[PDB]
Amino acid sequence: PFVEDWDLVQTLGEGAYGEVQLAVNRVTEEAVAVKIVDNIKKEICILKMLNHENVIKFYGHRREGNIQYLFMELASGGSLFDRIEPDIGMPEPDAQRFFHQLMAGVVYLHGIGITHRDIKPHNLLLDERDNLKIADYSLATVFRYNNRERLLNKMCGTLPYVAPELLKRREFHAEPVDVWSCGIVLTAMLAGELPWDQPSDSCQEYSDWKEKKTYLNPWKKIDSAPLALLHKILVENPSARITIPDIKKDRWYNKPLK
Numbered sequence: 001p002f003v004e005d006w007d008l009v010q011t012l013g014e015g016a017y018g019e020v021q022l023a024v025n026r027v028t029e030e031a032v033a034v035k036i037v038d039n040i041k042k043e044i045c046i047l048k049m050l051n052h053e054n055v056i057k058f059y060g061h062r063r064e065g066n067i068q069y070l071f072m073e074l075a076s077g078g079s080l081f082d083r084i085e086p087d088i089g090m091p092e093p094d095a096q097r098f099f100h101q102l103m104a105g106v107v108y109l110h111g112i113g114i115t116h117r118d119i120k121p122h123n124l125l126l127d128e129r130d131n132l133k134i135a136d137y138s139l140a141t142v143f144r145y146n147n148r149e150r151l152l153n154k155m156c157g158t159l160p161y162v163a164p165e166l167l168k169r170r171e172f173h174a175e176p177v178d179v180w181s182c183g184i185v186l187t188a189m190l191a192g193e194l195p196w197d198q199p200s201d202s203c204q205e206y207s208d209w210k211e212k213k214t215y216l217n218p219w220k221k222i223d224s225a226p227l228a229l230l231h232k233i234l235v236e237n238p239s240a241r242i243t244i245p246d247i248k249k250d251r252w253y254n255k256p257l258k
């Protein structure tokens with residue numbers, strides 16, 4: 001349980017992509033996280049680009065035979081997932097703060113031409129001051145390079161978080177897909193429940209939303225101001241969907257909260 005100066009003291013995450021260990025340096029006592037895996041070339045390359053307070057820092061990597069070691073910022077708060085009370089959510093002001101921090105993260109990624117592709121509470125970690133960090137770049141990819149956008153075609157992510165275009169279109173724009181998933185995260189924070197299994201015309205809950213039946217759950221647990229924002233985010237047509245610059249002008253986004 002040791003790689004060079006570091007001891008691998010306990011497990012933080014398991015199986016998802018290899019496993020995540022708490023790494024404590026026996027000399028310096030500094031603690032980091034280490035992702036251990038038995039594609040990784042791409043992930044490492046994207047990881048080396050990331051420099052922002054709401055993105056997980058990459059420290060470096062060591063290959064030791066079969067096993068790759070990715071040293072990363074430790075987020076000792078654990079995940080957003082664990083702060084969401086099932087069926088309840090969390091207090092609206094804590095949700096708003098996390099949403100602000102999530103948008104700052106996403107703007108940053110998009111600005112360097114990176115799309116995360118699997119935004120959800122498991123991948124949103126918290127430092128010891130409750131600062132949000134976007135983690136896990138194993139599905140991340142370049143969508144803008146030398147100022148030219150490339151459309152995506154791989155279907156990936158997590159179904160309850162994916163945008164509907166990803167199930168219907170041969171190719172689609174990256175940015176509105178990440179925006180959509182941020183809106184399902186906002187729903188989850190505010191209601192402690194996901195609104196649908198997947199955003200397909202065969203999913204009854206998704207049909208209900210498109211028919212504006214917001215007297216059903218989870219929408220009826222959400223105040224009208226954040227709900228008005230969720231109406232602009234979870235819009236089926238990605239070219240009509242709100243963009244982040246416009247999210248930042250929204251009334252609830254700018255509402256002062258406890």
Ligand SMILES: CC(C)n1cc(-c2cc(-c3ccc(CN4CCOCC4)cc3)cnc2N)nn1
Nearest residue numbers: 012013020033073074075076077078123135136
């Ligand atoms: C997304 C993937 C899962 N991952 C996780 C991490 C990561 C995870 C943690 C972390 C994970 C869990 C806890 C607390 N637990 C113990 C395991 O029972 C769930 C709660 C605390 C920190 C800290 N720092 C990271 N950098 N980095 N990448």
